[PDB]
Amino acid sequence: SDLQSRKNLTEEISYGLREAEQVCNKQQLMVESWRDFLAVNGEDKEEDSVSDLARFCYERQKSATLSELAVSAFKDAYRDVQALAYRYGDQSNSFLIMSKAGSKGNIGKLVQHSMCIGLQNSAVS
Amino acid sequence: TNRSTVKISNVPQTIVADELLRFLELHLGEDTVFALEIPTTRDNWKPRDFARVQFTTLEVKSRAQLLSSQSKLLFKTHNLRLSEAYDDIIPRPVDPRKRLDDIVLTVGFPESDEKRFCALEKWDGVRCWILTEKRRVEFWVWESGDCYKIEVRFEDIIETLSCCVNGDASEIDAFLLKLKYGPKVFKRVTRYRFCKEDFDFMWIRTTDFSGSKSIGTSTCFCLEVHNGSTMLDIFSGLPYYREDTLSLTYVDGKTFASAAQIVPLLNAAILGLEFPYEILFQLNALVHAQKISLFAASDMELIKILRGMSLETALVILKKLHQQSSICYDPVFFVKTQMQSVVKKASAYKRLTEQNIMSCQRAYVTPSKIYLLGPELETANYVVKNFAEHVSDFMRVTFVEEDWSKLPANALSVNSKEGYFVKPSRTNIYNRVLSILGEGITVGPKRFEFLAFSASQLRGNSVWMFASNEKVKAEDIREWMGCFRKIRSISKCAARMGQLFSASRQTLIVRAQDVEQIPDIEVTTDGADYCFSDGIGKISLAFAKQVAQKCGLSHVPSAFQIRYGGYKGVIAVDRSSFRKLSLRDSMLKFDSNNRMLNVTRWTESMPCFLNREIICLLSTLGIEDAMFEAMQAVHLSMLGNMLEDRDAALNVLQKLSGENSKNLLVKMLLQGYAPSSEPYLSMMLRVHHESQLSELKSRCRILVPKGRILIGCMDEMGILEYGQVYVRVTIGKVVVTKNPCLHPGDIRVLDAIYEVHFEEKGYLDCIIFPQKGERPHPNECSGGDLDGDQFFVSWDEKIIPSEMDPPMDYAGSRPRLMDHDVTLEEIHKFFVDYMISDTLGVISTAHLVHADRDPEKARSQKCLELANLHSRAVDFAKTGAPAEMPYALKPREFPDFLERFEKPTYISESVFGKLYRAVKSSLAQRGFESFIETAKAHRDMYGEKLTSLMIYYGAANEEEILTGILKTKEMYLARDNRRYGDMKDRITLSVKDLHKEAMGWFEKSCEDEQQKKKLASAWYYVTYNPNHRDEKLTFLSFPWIVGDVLLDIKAENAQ
């Protein structure tokens, strides 16, 4: 719209891209070295696994055997982010006409135009 | 009036709460919105379609609804349909005169004088909130930066007065609110909200914070509002407002301030050490009840006159203080007349070892104080019977709510998200219960330690406690009971430690030279283990005939449950026997060092009843609603004809429990008396007419004449394979089921056979099961073991369920064997872990209301998950696995059977709906001169002794202590039937003890049989003729204590 609706969309994208990171951070605790953390018992080093945010991003780069569940988790947490293109914008938008009819493109080629591009992963670098 | 929360229908999703309020404050007035809240499906970035808003007053809501009714409230091209929804997001009263903002609050115990009450501490300004819709009064107390909430509901308020502080003529400055139980102390522990105050708090429960336990000793709240004379009309909503002008005098009472955690205790620290414990126990019990104030309990002259006078003449002054209903303000006035009236007008230990009548001490622990009651008659236990000297050392400690209810899962271990996964955060009440389980209650010159708890005391949490004296301690009696170091799992060890605490009697000590081993018989197949021999023993006939005469039965018991030290199970009786104690392999529980012969149930036949799960399970096997209504009709005709006729009164009384061929009211009707001629049996049968109707409107309780309640048994030889038992009633098509049935698979129909050889064995109400072939009958029928339990049979031609089904896997999970031994700390952490995450009646309640609401009963995908979870919810005492009652299974509505006013009661249409509507249309239909002096001296001695049972428990007129059923229930007894079943037991034991004392008085009053027959005529004349009506009440129980010889007058006057 004219005013504050773009600001609401920006403040919602900035909060939906910070929850899809904590979703992917939860999936990296499914490693067999973390079997003592997922038990029903009190721990002392539990604050070191929730405060380190750069370390969990650094672990996603190297050792590409847990980075296949850190892409599929973002691709499942981004389905609730791509669904914001129906609450925002009128039904007479020329992109939602060509996306719902399946002529050229889809809903993935609209959120990169409007809200955010998403994730970027390559084969090998 | 009702509320102020108004739910908006559909606000647009691209709108924050700082934009909708700018529109709501445009059509309406300025700053008229208290708080607005929009629910989010995600955490902070996905709002839903609707939203909630709470206005300031009622006229703004009535204007906003009239504006929304004409479709004139258009916001962002979206109409708003304002509707009512009872949510109450902020519990605040919508009234400018009921919202106090500054009021001084003090606490303290009630007055020992007329108008001079003391105070412990005083808060400098609280926020008093008087709610009307939710019957509670809040108190917001600020202290050291923390916010505390004191909630006083309208049920504990018993009196409301107005006080005077300044001293002018007829001025209104303060108010005095009386309490009897105590409040609940909360604690405020920490884009779409507009709460314009301090908010986003979490009101979780906590312990006492007022210094060192200054709240639980008060039970009285004083409010001093500066206005006073204007808000006298809004205080009429408070219950029992006294129209009186009370004075006030501030007295400092800091001597009574204690420092321990158990309050209010009688501070007998300056009185010395030469004080009896039995006086201090009653003086502590009379303080928790609102009878004696705290300054009168610590007076020097009353303790001086109590100690300068003998003990048997001291207990009679303390037991008579319960006769006064109101608060007795003059403490010496009730003693100076009692000490002059006692001079004109042994059994403590003689009733423990002979007829098992003990005088135990009970106690209730509220989250803010403690509540002691006094001595009460109860069935003695074997663990108490050997220690006849330490009967004043045993003590039952219950842990209940401040309103004496069950502790919910909201006070202990409140849920809070921390990191990725949630974890239960423990509160202060949990650490208080753990601390009082570690240390114990220290009252008088002694303390108390943890002893044990049985498997029937986890539900309805209670703790047996011992004083740990210098002779025996809390560990010496447990070492005498056996050894519990071998069991490493704490859940099984906690059940094995208290298995000797059941009600049982000892007959004869059996040594260890008469023990013969018996091997186990397995019928296991396809990897699933079964046991045909599960706690089955064999006994000799001579010692069985000995223990039958020792216990006091007519015939020999064919099967009876026994506890030979650590053993537990039932014993079968054969003919060719040579030993007494012959236990099987599945009988060891711990090291059986103790040698006893404790029995709990003999061989007797009760008539078969019905359960609501039985009627709910038989209605989905191919049986319609055909014979249930006919059986209920022929039940209701006999229950409506028993109040008028005599044979109809004798038919149902001989079929119901409590009149097993020997009763007081049965032999009265044996002569042929009219049920309405005398005013005693009429009022005796008046409550018996409505007892079965109350059991028909709450439970089902359908009388089934075909069948007999019988105990399980097993034959050692084995001839029958997949056959039923030849029963003995004082055939075929029998249906065998136990009580905890939820699956549709454990229905079992058998066929009885006539055997020409079983008449020599003598099996009387004992079902025989096969012990070979495939899976056995009772182990696949609701998981019932082969021990002593109940069984329901019917050789009737009414139901006959001809639809069997193989049940699911009844195997449990792996036992949680600990690595180290049990060091007495993992037992308390398991006992407090039973108050939370324990849904036993909840699963059965949610399963019973789910079959009537959905088609294909007990076969859908939702009805099977509850039946699977019920196998784990009942096995908490064996394996430590929680029930974990999930969401999306409660139907959020209840039918018209239980009648809970919280959920909306929909109109039911099922087998139980026509079963309830048929009964519900039938409630609106309906020595003649030588014994005068002895009877005149015994009638008052019976009457004033019967008042001590009358007004101690809350009987109505005469029948609530005679028959044991209560007419008017209480708050803590209308929903807890498990405690009511033990209350009606100890009422009947007390009136039976009074009848035994009257029979003992009868033996010291007659020497001739003609005098024994003529005493009943005079004892009938004193209480039946209207010329001897005194000022007090004349109870209709005087010719029933000697009622055996009273029937001979009517048998002699006929001839």
Ligand SMILES: [Mg+2]
């Ligand atoms: Mg059993």
